[PDB]
Amino acid sequence: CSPGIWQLDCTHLEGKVILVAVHVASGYIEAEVIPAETGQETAYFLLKLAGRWPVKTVHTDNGSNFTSTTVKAACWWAGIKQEFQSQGVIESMNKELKKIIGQVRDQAEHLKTAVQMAVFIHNHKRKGGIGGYSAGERIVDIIATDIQTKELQKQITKIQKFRVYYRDSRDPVWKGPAKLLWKGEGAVVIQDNSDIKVVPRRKAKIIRDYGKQM
């Protein structure tokens, strides 16, 4: 739901403009200084960005890079789909980054260096007492949760699909198929959507094979 959704902010800068990227949840940013701003320049960055983190889609604030044919072309290479107070605050988070580049501006002669550094700052950035909650942890845990979510969901999908049929004890009629909570050789646990029940394996019936979508 929340994953794979990132937000990109254009930067109008002294000298060269730059563009910054964040999964709104991750908090990570991979902003680059742009030697020249072009819909065609944008893409190469997007190409790199996609490798480090898969993004299903990115909402865009500005039509002009999206209008640029180049941009769209990359979204199809990737499979990334361009999408048509919080962001004004994220712009203020980028402003904070600008202020960060400012807090480091004196430190650095090359602005581009200051920006990447700034990125290193948002990253690995604790808030007050650290309390874990690492900005650096970003959604990286959410990535893992998603990876696991993928696995679990997979074993899950095989079960959700399957149908197991049980017959009420002392009832000629056999109850309609339902998802099964547990499998044992001696016994099995299952849940009717309406009610949840556990039954003897000898009492238990199951349908092993179905195959589609290659």
Q: Which is nearer to ligand LF0, 47 or 152 (CB)?
A: 47
Q: Mask of contacts with ligand LF0, 53-92, x by CB under 6 A?
A: ----------------xx--xx--x---------------
**Chosen residue from 5, 24, 117, 121 binding ligand LF0 by CB under 6 A:** 117
Q: Quick one: 49 exposed, middle or buried, by C-beta within 10 A (0-12, 13-18, 19+)?
A: buried
Alpha-carbon span 138 to 125, nearest angstrom:
10
90: nearest Cα among 180, 17, 28: 28
User: Would you state the structure tokens that stand for residue 116, as one six-digit string?
Assistant: 């990447």
DSSP 100-141: HHHHTTTT-S-HHHHHHHHHHHHTT---SS--S--TTTTTHH
Across the strands, what pairs with 6?
Answer: 23, 58
Q: Which stretch binds a copy of itself (CB under 8 A): 1-9, 10-18, 88-96, 139-147?
A: 139-147
Alpha-carbon span 125 to 140, nearest angstrom:
14
Q: 44 to 103, contacts with a copy of itself by CB under 8 A?
A: 44, 47-48, 50-52, 54, 77-78
83 belongs to an annotated ligand binding site? no
Other Cβ atoms less than 10 A from the Cβ of 170: the count is: 5
Cβ of residue 19: shortest distance to ligand LF0, in angstroms? 13
How far from chain centre, in Å, is Cα 89? 21
- Is residue 174 within the footprint of ligand LF0 (CB under 6 A)? no
Q: Which stretch binds ligand LF0 (CB under 6 A): 42-50, 125-133, 181-189, 195-203?
A: 42-50
137 belongs to an annotated ligand binding site? no
Known binding positions: 9, 61, 91
Note the residues at the interface with a copy of itself (CB under 8 A): 28-30, 32, 43-44, 47-48, 50-52, 54, 77-78, 112-113, 116-117, 119-120, 123-124, 132-133, 136-137, 140-141, 143-144, 147, 151
Residues annotated in a binding site for Mg(2+): 9, 61, 91
